[PDB]
Write a protein that binds this ligand. Sequence first.
Ligand code: K
Ligand code: K
Ligand code: K
Ligand code: K
Ligand code: K
Ligand code: K
Ligand code: K
Ligand code: K
Ligand code: K
Ligand code: K
Ligand code: MG
Ligand code: MG
Ligand code: MG
Ligand code: MG
Ligand code: MG
Ligand code: MG
Ligand code: MG
Ligand code: MG
Ligand code: MG
Ligand code: MG
Ligand code: MG
Ligand code: MG
Ligand code: MG
Ligand code: MG
Ligand code: MG
Ligand code: MG
Lengths: 230, 259, 186, 145
Amino acid sequence: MKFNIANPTTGCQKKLEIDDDQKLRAFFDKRISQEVSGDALGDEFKGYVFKIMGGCDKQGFPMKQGVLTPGRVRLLLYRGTPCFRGYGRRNGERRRKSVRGCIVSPDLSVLNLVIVKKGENDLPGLTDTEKPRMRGPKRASKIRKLFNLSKEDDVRKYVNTYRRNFTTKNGKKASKAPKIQRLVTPLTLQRKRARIADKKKRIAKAKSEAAEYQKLLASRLKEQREKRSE
Amino acid sequence: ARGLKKHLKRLNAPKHWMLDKLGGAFAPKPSSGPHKSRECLPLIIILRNRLKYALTYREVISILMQRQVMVDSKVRTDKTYPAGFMDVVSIPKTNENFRLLYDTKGRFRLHSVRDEEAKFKLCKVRSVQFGQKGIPYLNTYDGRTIRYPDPLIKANDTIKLDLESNKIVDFIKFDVGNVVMVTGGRNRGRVGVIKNREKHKGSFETVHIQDALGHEFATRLGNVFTLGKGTKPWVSLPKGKGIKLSIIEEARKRLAAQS
Amino acid sequence: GISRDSMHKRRATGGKKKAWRKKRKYELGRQPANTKISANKTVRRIRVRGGNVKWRALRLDTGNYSWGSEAVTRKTRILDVVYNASNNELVRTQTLVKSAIVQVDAAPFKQWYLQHYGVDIKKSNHVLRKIETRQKDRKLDPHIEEQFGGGRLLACISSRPGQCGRADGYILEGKELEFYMKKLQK
Amino acid sequence: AEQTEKAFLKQPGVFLSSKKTGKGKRPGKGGNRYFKSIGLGFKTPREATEGTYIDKKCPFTGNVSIRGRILAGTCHSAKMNRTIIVRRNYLHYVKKYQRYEKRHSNIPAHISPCFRVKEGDHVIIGQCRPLSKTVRFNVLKVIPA
RNA sequence: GAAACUGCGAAUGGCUCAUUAAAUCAGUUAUAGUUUGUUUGAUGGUAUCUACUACUCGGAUAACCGUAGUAAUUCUAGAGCUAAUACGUGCAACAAACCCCGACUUCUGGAAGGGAUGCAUUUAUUAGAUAUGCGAUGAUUCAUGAUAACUCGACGGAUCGCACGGCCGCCGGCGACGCAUCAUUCAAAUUUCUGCCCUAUCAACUUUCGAUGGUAGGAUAGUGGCCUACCAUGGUGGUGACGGGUGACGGAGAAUUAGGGUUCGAUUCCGGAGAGGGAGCCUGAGAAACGGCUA
Ligand SMILES: [K+]
Ligand SMILES: [K+]
Ligand SMILES: [K+]
Ligand SMILES: [K+]
Ligand SMILES: [K+]
Ligand SMILES: [K+]
Ligand SMILES: [K+]
Ligand SMILES: [K+]
Ligand SMILES: [K+]
Ligand SMILES: [K+]
Ligand SMILES: [Mg+2]
Ligand SMILES: [Mg+2]
Ligand SMILES: [Mg+2]
Ligand SMILES: [Mg+2]
Ligand SMILES: [Mg+2]
Ligand SMILES: [Mg+2]
Ligand SMILES: [Mg+2]
Ligand SMILES: [Mg+2]
Ligand SMILES: [Mg+2]
Ligand SMILES: [Mg+2]
Ligand SMILES: [Mg+2]
Ligand SMILES: [Mg+2]
Ligand SMILES: [Mg+2]
Ligand SMILES: [Mg+2]
Ligand SMILES: [Mg+2]
Ligand SMILES: [Mg+2]
């Protein structure tokens, strides 16, 4: 069948097809989470350990982790879970769909694999280069952790380090940097101060109202007592 | 139905709104607010149907979204906001202050009031009880809650509320000899002085009211609003002073005016 | 599901009622909790009408029990179920329902009695004076005293474990205690 | 005396095993028997104030309030336990013939142990919350007849 | 500013009259027998207590990008990023008063120290009077207060826009969104009394397996044989029960008019019910929803 090999370290993927049953014998009877040595799968895959991630069958149905069968079953699935995306469907809506079991079998049409251990010889399409991350950290804490900044270092200046510059299709010069989140600014401190002040004013108003009511009751009771004595 | 209704058919709108039969299939459904749906006058009717500042629904929304209309000294941007009895409607741009009062025919009338008279309103007390921590409070029939009320104030009394400070500045006890206006029933909008009160255990109480011309009528306790102490109302009444005129005398006056 | 409507019932005359609408969600019922005594506490959260919350107790071990005469409430352990008025089978299964008669550990109440009255069922002069003053009105029901010997106290569950998730109650006293002891002595 | 059930019957909220005594305490306080006046001009029977029966559905000593419609009728049946059938007799107007026809209504009503009723006497029943499948009324007064 | 996440809505409206004969429904009642997103008015004081970010906590995922499967679907699996008013945590500005234990003590005392103490839940005890203080109703051990405890509490703001100021870094305005409590408004659910066409070639019916009532429980938002266990034999009926028919949804109303009456009411307003027939259910304040799901 076909194979989808992904290298998280380098962010590279490649499609591989095998038609020899002897090589595929290693993957058969394995499960979605188990690891398979790449020695059987070709010769250039020596020293490479592959971790299964999933795959589809000859009808396109995906494999579901936990279904300990090699066949296809029907399950009632929640939206957002694997094998049921449920885009455009209502909240709390479930659907009965067909999924294949987690056990590898010849009925599969493709397998998804992840390189967990690198072998002696690199593969020309996977490990030669690495695709850089497009977006850097956006949270202030993440930026501080990335550059090992202290509590006094200005995280603002380090954002320009990974800002990406480019030329628009018109030929214009443009640059883009992320907006930092969870960054302490004077406005946040002012908002906190205003919250505390509002709490203080509420407490003071309640105390004053209670005192005024007690005074009114005391005055009325004094008047009533004076009336009673006569 | 499976839940709250959001529409109001025009024929089902209260008759005192005076909506055209063929104006449309729907009427503005009053929003939740201090006043009940059947006993309110939405701002859309006031601005479009009554004052004619807006010629359309869209114009009403446009006027209101500029923050130009205030109800009880607070800016309201909701077209279907329920404005009811004794409420003050002010438009600072036009220097207009209105008080919502029932005319002799039982329909809300925008009574122009002075600047001083626009700083307060009257409210009817529903009940007085103890809140959390034992704090006494009372609630009015316009959805208001006031803590630490005067111990003398009790249910069915009228309190003078200062809108600027949101404080009770005076109150009227419900008693015989007080000028009142009827806020419900066939006698809605009439003004007179209470003569006697009939109380029936486990049943509604009947109030007997005498008009300034000696005409007598009776209504339920919940339909009586006290307007002052004695015979002088604390607020200016609309034209007619709550005097219901028979159709014969109305026709006589109309014919006299014609000539 | 379980329905609380009267449509399925007969008329007071005995005649049959013909259906004119389907079941409504606002007249539903849910399965009983059937709470039991077990060291493995398990309380389930139920979302009910209006977004409110109910607590379904499947297994409870301890409860909040109060001594009426002494005006003392302590958290103790429920030992077993001895009597149930509604159904005798509910005693065999150790079901925890309101008004069931249970035996609770007396250790917290014994400790409170020792600390308060200075009696078993260093010290400062002021504490001794306080205890002596409290000793004048120290009157104890003999039946409760005999119960304290075995370490268990008869109690009645006054809460609803299937609704609030707690098996709270009070200790039997006086005529009620005599009544239930007589019913249990058989 | 009244402990004829499998469970102990008592008035809720009436603490009995108190160290103090209910000498000057109001009803329901200090262990004293609880009772109340239902209003509407009705008088609490002397048998409910000094009785020993436990009845949570009793208007004067139970947990049921009287509100709604007060009706009069004749005791049609007194065979149930603390429940009677009250037959109300009235005339229905037949408009076309300008005449009347006799009609009756059977109204199940709870009767407290403080009342002694018999088939044929006049009774006054007040409305309360549903008490059983068909009972919505409580006996408030009996005329022996 | 597309896209996407988040939030809200889609329970309204429109359509139809199949089922349904004290049932729906009309008038008239009740909730002291309950729930109620929202609007309007008021109200938010104890979290770490010996870890010890609060000048601000943590881990993901969409869009995006790139390896795809299937004949195929807002059918679907891996891989690489990155946000929050998403998710999960967490200091929660600081007190007083009340209650319990209480070393120590000039000891009928007061005393260091400790425990408890927000709001909410649950159960007990207690006050809540009224022929020198104490609220409301026709009527409530009602509102509400106090004590003992209890709960492995989705609560008690790690949010956002405008401006730009006064003291000596500290303070500071106008708003938005959001959490909790009460009241109110918008409503529902159940409910009291009276009322419906033809038929006796329908006179007895209901009660194993709830029929009528009682006791104790369970369930419910809440009352109730609504359900369970035990107990009693009850409940309706020529003042027509029960059974059957209806080419029967009920009403506001329509036609005709001496008066009385006769006939009609599917259809635009009100109320109910249904979404090919049943049944079950998630989400949600609200649905037994069907331009939602499951059989
Ligand atoms: K931010
Ligand atoms: K959306
Ligand atoms: K919704
Ligand atoms: K009705
Ligand atoms: K009082
Ligand atoms: K009818
Ligand atoms: K119930
Ligand atoms: K029962
Ligand atoms: K119908
Ligand atoms: K919602
Ligand atoms: Mg609709
Ligand atoms: Mg039909
Ligand atoms: Mg009826
Ligand atoms: Mg509300
Ligand atoms: Mg209370
Ligand atoms: Mg019950
Ligand atoms: Mg019709
Ligand atoms: Mg038809
Ligand atoms: Mg049609
Ligand atoms: Mg309709
Ligand atoms: Mg439906
Ligand atoms: Mg069809
Ligand atoms: Mg279908
Ligand atoms: Mg359906
Ligand atoms: Mg359709
Ligand atoms: Mg629809």
